[PDB]
Amino acid sequence: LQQIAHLRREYTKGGLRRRDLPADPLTLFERWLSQACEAKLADPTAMVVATVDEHGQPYQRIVLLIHYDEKGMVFYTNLGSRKAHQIENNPRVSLLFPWHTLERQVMVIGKAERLSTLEVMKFFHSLPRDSQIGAWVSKQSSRISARGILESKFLELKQKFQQGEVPLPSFWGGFRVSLEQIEFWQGGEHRLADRFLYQRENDAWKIDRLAP
Template structure:
């Protein structure tokens, strides 16, 4: 056994007060995200997406947040991937942001919905051309014989669309996760962390309360 119990860190970066936090969690998220982004992290849009398969087994993977607004969080993927099939069968999902340099976490629970084809088109064509071609070359989550097979498919689609726009695949698009619950966590000394929970009560209404750490 590799014993890691002696690795300890005190969290002293700040506090989170339920009296001064925003009444709307997306407003609070925006404030925290902008503070995090100002620290120049390597990849500020990283988040963990959790979904559940047909047997009830949770899955997690890191994806990239591509936009957010008052309605929720937007990301893009292959609809025929593991997560695509899982979200089609059970649209309840969770997001997690971990910003260690600020000693903060944000978790989000809610329901996903597909974005419109027009929204997917607009984002797809903003991507680098090589990423567009990669969406055609990769049958995401399916077995692959070896790296050479993937590279051969990439070469084939590169030749197929040489000199023309790369179309959006039918199986590729975006989701918006509409939050029903959000929790903000600020590390505190002696493990007395600050946890603030928002639960949706109605259209545009949120109950905000402090939780024990």
């Protein structure tokens, strides 16, 4: 708890100049994610996902980043959830990594596309057994009349699955968010943040500094 405090002070010694930026924004994201992990932030892979309903109202919630590469950033969710309904009507989403403990933010803008069954199955059968079970329990985002509904169904499903592999719910899936824009924010001198926007354009990245 002094080792962690020290690491956070070192990773917060930030300037951020254009000439030190990598060509691929995911190189910088990888570096900051590794620092969030080493500094033991709570849930370093946690990201706030924003979606928009049919009335133009934005909604937000935290999800975990499970995978990223050039094709985008992946999370898993219940396909009957509010976020899945909103994505089906409007695939435009924003992701924000709230790394303000290290004076950082990352924001990703892109379109969410569903994962295939093969991808979902691979991830599901990597989860701890008790995570597989919980995925069955909850009709995510529906009104429920009592907490006991969850607790009862959890007990029943434990009993039902006890002596086999936990099957994949038909209602569990995932989304990959394309990399149209990636924005980096790092606290800077005189409380003037360094801010860079990577914009995907003509199979390349256009980088601009933004005023904070």
